[PDB]
Each structure stands twice: as structure tokens, then as C-alpha cells.
């Protein structure tokens, strides 16, 4: 009954299987995932807030796009003003993942900007235990890469600890 | 003749008056400004353009603080942008950041921060406000709870400044 809300926006698909391995994890630890994206906008089934209020911890996972998430997420994010005004989140656990189609990084520092919302939201911050910051994924230059052992163990190990630390605070 | 685009987004106001003020900085510093918006953006003042941004001579972004980030429809508008990358359109160009908040919680300092990351993942050379001179990293504004606080003396003249000092770098950048 609990879940973990493994929450992602995805243009070409790396970060919809990210998001599909980490639920894995996430069972692996014990817990229901529910997988959700968000719609495209302009001037999986899509979250909503209630699915957000009512996570036992958060995955979050975007693309690179100059070293911020994707905006489509940002969007989602920014109606969560009374999620915050309330203390919806607080205490919750929380990671990011990220995927990115280019060669000269990017993702760590995108994973990091990424926590500043988790933490303005009173989550608990955590990533992958000896990036430290999160799951990452290099998708090629035509985003069709596939996740390699290393990427694919580290998604499932992300969802696993999410799903972990939701059963020590839980009980 | 060269211009700093001034590009924010705004939903109550605050950021846009700080557009203008950085605008008067950039007179001071001997440059014409461009001050642009972006529109509002929803699932499925003039507002800038992809040119405006790509022939710009330097960069000042602003949003009002949105969770630690800017706010989505300016990072929206930075989505687009990755012709202007692949053909380095912004590279060397001097870019500074500002910010306004509703809120006494804080995180003026890192969404800046966040912000200064797009500008350098297209090759910009970021500048803030050294305070040496009789936050370091761009001008901030307390907008007040209804975001309608006008901005102080204090804040005024930071934004000129910051303004003045992206002007003054683009003229030393350009001979
Ligand atoms: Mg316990
Ligand atoms: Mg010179």
C-alpha cells in the first residue's frame, strides 16, 4: 500500500527506463512504485499532487537541459505551493536521476540543482553511497543508449535505498 | 550598436522592475539595453527572441525564486536555446543573474547560483557584484508576502550596479 513516487519527464525514453529500473528497485526494498511523468508544455499516467502529498519518498528524474531539469518538470514543481505551505513533504525521502546525450557533463551539476527543490520541501536528501548525487545515464548521441550494467545496477540500487529508508522512518 | 539583453520572467512585478533598473545601469555603462520577457507556459512588455538572445553583447537573466530554481517558463524559454549552443552563439558573452522572492525562507543565493549554470553551459563569462567597491553572485529583491514590496534604495542601486558593471565588461570585452 505505501509507494514510492518515481516522478520523471522523458523526451527520447532514457529516463522513462531509468524510471522503470529504479521502480524495480523500489519493490526490491519492499515497497509499491508508482511511476508517473508529467505533460509536455507551450506558451506513464501523468502525476498529480495527491500522488506527490502522498509518497512515502520521491524519485525524481529529468534529462539534462543546461544544467537544470527539463521544464516540463520545473512546471509540475512550481504548482506545488501548497505542498509547501503546508509541510506536505517534510521528512519524506528524496533522490533525482538524470540521463544526458552529451559528452561533456553536465549531470552532476544538474542532479545538484535538482535537490534544491527536494530541500525546500523539507525532504530527507539522499543518493548513491560509495555520483554520490544521484542516477545517471549517458543516452548517446541519439538518446537510444541503452543502460549499461553499471547505470542499470545503480538505478536499481537508488530505488531499493529510497524504498529502505521510507521503512526505517516508517517503523 | 551592441545591446545587454535583459531577459526575465515575472509574476507579480518585482523582477520586471528590476529588469528596468539593471537596464539604467546598462545606460550608465555606455551600452543600449534590450529588456525581453517570456510568456507564460501551460500543459497541452515584449517577449524575447531566440535572435534577441543570440546577437545580444551580454546577458542579464531574472526570475522571481521558484523552490531553489528559476522560474518554468523562463527555463522554458533556455530549453530552446540549443541552436544558439551548437553554434556558440553566447560564448564569451558576460552574463550576470537577479533574482526577487516572496518569501523570509530564503534561496535567493542558490537559485542564482542555479541560474549562473545554463549561462555557463553556454560558454558565457558569469560576473556578479563585488562588494569590495566603497549577494556575490547577482542583485536580489525581498518582494514581500503579496509581492508587491517596492524595491529600497539599497536594491535600486545594487541593480543599476550590477547593470553598469555587465555594460563596463561588454565595452572592455569589445575593445
Ligand atoms: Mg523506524
Ligand atoms: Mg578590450
Redesign the interface.
Known sequence: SPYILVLYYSRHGATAEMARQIARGVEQGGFEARVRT??????ALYATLEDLKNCAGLALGSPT????????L??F??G?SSL?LTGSLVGKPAAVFTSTASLHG?QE??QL?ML??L???GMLVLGIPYTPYGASHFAGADGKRSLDEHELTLCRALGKRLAETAGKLGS
Do not use: E, I
Not at 508529467?38 to 506558451?43: D, N
Not at 537541459?65 to 521544464?71: L, P, V
Open positions: 508529467v505533460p509536455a508544455v507551450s506558451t537541459r543546461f544544467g537544470n531539469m527539463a521544464s516540463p520545473k512546471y514543481l512550481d506545488t509547501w553536465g551539476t544538474t540543482s534544491l527543490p530541500l525546500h520541501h
